[PDB]
Design a protein that fits this description.
The chain has no helices and two strands. The chain is mainly beta and 52 residues long. The protein has a two-stranded antiparallel sheet with strand order 1-2. The protein starts with 25 loop residues before the first strand and ends in a 10-residue tail after the last strand. It is 0% helix and 15% strand. The structure holds one DNA strand of 94 nucleotides. This is DNA-directed RNA polymerase subunit alpha. Belongs to the RNA polymerase alpha chain family.
Length: 52
DNA sequence: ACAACCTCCTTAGTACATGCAACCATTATCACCGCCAGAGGTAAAATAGTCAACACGCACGGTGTTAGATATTTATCCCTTGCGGTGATAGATT
């Protein structure tokens, strides 16, 4: 699919299909107000709009 | 009249900062032994008592029966799963 007829002016790019700009990571205690020997994952993701 | 100066004299004033680990010995040296103190000993009687006797009298614990609880069994019920149909989201615009 890289050996098709591409005119002198048809520019070419990779599979750009997703606009996310950060994904982070932390770990601290859960909210679960009584079941409290247990942790939570945190990931602080960030984009450009298009999806929160 | 003293002044400091030439030389090697000796004296002696100091030697940066933070922290952790380890355990606490060596001496010899007559203390004599005489006296007597209150002061050690203990017999006999105060400050008072033991524990064995024969009584007294009670608590506790183990054997027995009873009680009822619990953990099992059974079976019911609901809350949940996963997929699906199609939801008004996300957010761009009005």
């Amino acid at each position: 699919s890289e050996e098709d007829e591409r005119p002198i002016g048809r520019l070419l790019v990779d599979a750009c299909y997703s606009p996310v700009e950060r994904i982070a990571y932390n770990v601290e205690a859960a909210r679960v107000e009584q079941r409290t020997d247990l942790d939570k994952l945190v990931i602080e993701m960030e984009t450009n709009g298009t999806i929160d």
